[PDB]
Design a protein around this ligand. Sequence first.
Ligand SMILES: C[S@@+](CC[C@H](N)C(=O)[O-])C[C@H]1O[C@@H](n2cnc3c(N)ncnc32)[C@H](O)[C@@H]1O
Ligand SMILES: [Zn+2]
Ligand SMILES: [Zn+2]
Ligand SMILES: [Zn+2]
Length: 425
Amino acid sequence: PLKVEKFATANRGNGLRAVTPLRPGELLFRSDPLAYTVCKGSRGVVCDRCLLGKEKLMRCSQCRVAKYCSAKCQKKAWPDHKRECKCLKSCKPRYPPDSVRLLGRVVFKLMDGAPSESEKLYSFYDLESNINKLTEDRKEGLRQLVMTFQHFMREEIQDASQLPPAFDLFEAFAKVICNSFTICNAEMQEVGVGLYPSISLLNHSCDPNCSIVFNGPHLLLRAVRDIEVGEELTICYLDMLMTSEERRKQLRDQYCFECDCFRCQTQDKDADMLTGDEQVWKEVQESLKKIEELKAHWKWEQVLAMCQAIISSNSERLPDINIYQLKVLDCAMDACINLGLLEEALFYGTRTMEPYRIFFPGSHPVRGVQVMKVGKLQLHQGMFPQAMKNLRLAFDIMRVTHGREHSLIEDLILLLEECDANIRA
Ligand SMILES: C[S@@+](CC[C@H](N)C(=O)[O-])C[C@H]1O[C@@H](n2cnc3c(N)ncnc32)[C@H](O)[C@@H]1O
Ligand SMILES: [Zn+2]
Ligand SMILES: [Zn+2]
Ligand SMILES: [Zn+2]
C-alpha cells in the first residue's frame, strides 16, 4: 500500500502528504518517466535510453540522432523512438529544443502506449499549467514552442485527431515548463529531462523533508526527515547554491510563485554565500555561464582551463564558501576526475567539503555524492583512514538519500569493504 496520498492544500494547489509516519531514508515512491529525453549537451555523449556515458555510441541508422550504448538499448528504445525518428529525420539538420522533443514523446506515449504507472497518483492531464499567472513575455515564448512542435512533428501529427482528446499544445507546454524534472546521472551531471506526473504532486520547499534521486531514468522519492501522518511532503526544486534573490527569480519565472519559507524571509545563508569582493564574484558568476555550458557539453579541458584561471588567478581571489567560487571548485574537481588528473581533483574536492557541509544541511544527495567522490579519490591515493572516514560519511548520507534500491549504494558498499580490508591489513 502507498505511504503517500494526494490532497488539496490550502494555498498551493494539490500536494502529497504522508499516510503513515515516515523516517529518514524511507522509500516513498518510485517511478519511470511518462516520457524523457537526453538533454542538448549530452546528446551523442550518453545513451538515449539508459543515460550512461560511453566512449563510442551507436547511432540509429534512420535518423542518426538517437544514439545508444548497446544493441539492447537501441532495440528496447525502438517502440518509444519510432515515431520521433521520422520527425527527427524529416527536419534534419534542425534539432528541436529539449521541451519539444519531450512533448513529442509525451504525445506518442499518450496516443499509443498503455496507461503509464508514472501517472498512478496524478496524470499529465492533471498537471498545473499556471496559465492565469503567465506573463505576456512567457506566453509569446510558449507560442513559439507550439509552432516549433507543429513544424517538428508534421510527419507524424497533422491534426487534432492525432492528439489526445481536447489536447491543447499551448497548455501542454505551460505544463512542461513547471513540471519538468532534470535527470542527473550517478555523478550528478545533468543528462536528461523527463516528466514524472505522480512526483509532480510534490510542492517546493527551500528546506524540504523529502528528496528525489535518479538511477538512470528511474526516480526514487525518499524521506530525508521524520514526517508525521498528514504532514505535507516537499522537495527542493532548486539548486542549494543559490541566494534567496536567485531562488525568488527562478520560482517566479519558472513556477509562478513567491516562496514564503523562513529561509526566504530571513535571507538565510545569503551573506555567507556572497563573501569576498563583490567585483570579483560578479566576474566569476559571469564566467560560470560559459563554464557551466562547457560542462553541460562534457568539454572537460575547456572547463578545467577556465576554472584554473579563477582558482589560481594572479588577481584577487574569493573564499571557498562564496557560492560562485564553490561552483568553480566543483566544476574543476569534476573536470579533473574525467581527465584522470586525480591529485588535482582531490585538491579541489577537499576544498569543497566544509562549504558543502554548510550549504547542504541534513541528508542531501548532492553532498552524499561529493563526499563519496572525495573518499574514492583518497582511497585511490592510499589515504585509508581519511578515505574510510569520508566513505562512511557518504554512506551515512546516501543510506538516506539513495537507499538500497539505488545502484550507487552497491558501488559505495564495495569501496567501504575495500577500504576496511586495507585498514585491517
Ligand atoms: C510540480 S507542481 C506541484 C504540484 C501542484 N501544486 C499542483 O497542484 O499540481 C509546481 C507548482 O506548484 C505550485 N507550488 C509548488 N510549491 C509551492 C510553494 N511552496 N508555494 C506556492 N506554490 C507552490 C506552483 O503552482 C508551482 O508552479
Ligand atoms: Zn544504454
Ligand atoms: Zn531514429
Ligand atoms: Zn523559500
